[PDB]
């Protein structure tokens, strides 16, 4: 074992697991999911005495993993995962998922043209997850046409600015609980324009962080066995956090 030395001892045998998923979505204007995937990694931070043999178990039956490499120390086959981890922080596994992804937010855009002069836009977001969980760091980014003289917005939650240099309205919300709805309206004031070329309407995109794996993955157990030393599994202090963040998360209209 060239990844972990042999004299390692800790008063407090403790490990930390991070499940870090980025969830990607391309959604049609009429709500069809055009494309969706999740990339994830499990990072482990372990302060464990000796040369312990852990078994990592999750609900891979109950979700479907489409492939994934592991860390050198993983013993290859419920065909569950086995290893002696390096001390400190390392990447346990990396994975991909396409089936049965929880799409934490739903974006519902509504767009109305007022002659040649104004666009009326309403955008609704819906959080799709347990009410006890908060999403945070939410941005909705609404692209505006190149011939935009100015923008008025109203929204009850958050703050929104027109950012002319980037041709987008950006709406930010610090936190938002599962199973809710929020909306923004904007009046976009148009300059006159070359009648011929139509507006090539980029999607509305989102940023967010959520405290669960959007793939549905959960950690069931991480079992520690070091059989020379006089600690056992139930002496180990175990922590998990899940951090699901948006990758490319777009809704067309």
């Amino acid at each position: 074992i060239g990844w972990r030395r042999e004299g390692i001892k800790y008063r407090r045998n403790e490990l930390f697991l991070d499940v870090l998923e980025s969830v990607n979505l391309l959604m049609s204007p009429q709500g069809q999911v055009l494309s969706a995937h999740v990339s994830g990694r499990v990072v482990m931070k372990s302060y464990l005495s000796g040369m312990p043999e852990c078994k990592f178990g999750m609900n891979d039956k109950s979700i479907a993993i489409d492939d994934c490499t592991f860390h050198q120390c993983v013993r290859l086959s419920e065909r569950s995962i086995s290893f002696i981890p390096p001390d400190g922080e390392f990447e346990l596994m990396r994975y991909r998922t396409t089936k049965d992804i929880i799409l934490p937010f739903r974006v519902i855009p509504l767009v109305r043209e007022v002659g040649r002069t104004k666009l009326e836009v309403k955008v609704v977001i819906k959080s799709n997850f347990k009410p006890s969980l908060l999403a945070q760091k939410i941005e909705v980014r609404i692209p505006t046409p190149l011939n935009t003289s100015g923008v008025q917005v109203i929204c009850m939650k958050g703050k929104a600015k027109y950012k002319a240099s980037e041709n987008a309205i950006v709406w930010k919300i610090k936190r938002m609980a599962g199973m809710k709805e929020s909306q923004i309206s904007a009046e976009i004031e148009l300059l006159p324009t070359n009648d011929k070329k139509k507006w090539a309407r980029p999607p509305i995109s989102m940023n967010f962080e959520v405290p669960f794996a959007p793939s549905g993955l959960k950690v069931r157990y991480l079992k520690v066995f070091e059989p020379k030393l006089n600690y056992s599994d139930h002496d180990v202090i175990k922590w998990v956090r899940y951090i699901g963040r948006s990758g490319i998360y777009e809704t067309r209209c």
């Binding site: 945070q136 405290p211 950690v219 157990y221 202090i237 998990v240």
Partner: peptide
């Protein structure tokens, strides 16, 4: 969103 939960569940 980035708080450690103690123990693993299912």
């Amino acid at each position: 969103v980035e708080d450690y939960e103690q123990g693993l569940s299912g």
